[PDB]
Amino acid sequence: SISISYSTTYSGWTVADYLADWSAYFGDVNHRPGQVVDGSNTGGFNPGPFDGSQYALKSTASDAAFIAGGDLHYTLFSNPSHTLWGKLDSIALGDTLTGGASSGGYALDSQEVSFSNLGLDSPIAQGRDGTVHKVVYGLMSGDSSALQGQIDALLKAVDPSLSINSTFDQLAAAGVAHATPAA
């Protein structure tokens, strides 16, 4: 089942609350045609350059950041172009990236919430319509709807009473979430 870790700072928050709020701070890095010309809004893979167990990206509006974990692959200019696909196990959200390929891996200085054991696997054949692509490109572009939908489906798979409109606390009571110390 999905496993969620959250700082007790967000006790009382719903998952949807938090994601909407995080997305508001992160904004949109404008990773769009004609608007990616350097490393300021690409993010990066570990080990990379185009494949990794992690992909990480910091906001260009704030120091909000996320890390996607799993077995991940970006097609860049090969077909289907600009598609992230593969296995997505985790999404970790917070503030300020640290580390990298040459540091033992990426991490967040403040990791606020993470979602793991997502069990998502999108084949390259699905192109940008794959769930993995939609989830991560959504986050990059200021739209966490895809992530929210997937989390909601995973929670309801555990029990139909669970939701992204559940508080983190309720999800902990249900055995899916685990509180970590204040942020």
Ligand code: MH0
């Ligand atoms: C190797 C650097 C690099 C990384 C890392 C990178 C990471 C990501 N990308 Fe993405 N991306 C990179 C280099 C580009 C460029 C250079 C362009 C601009 C293409 C153009 O101007 O026609 C771009 N990406 C453009 C895109 C576009 C726009 C394509 C279009 O509308 O035609 C999407 C959807 C995209 N990416 C997805 C992603 C996703 C998802 C990730 C996360 C893995």
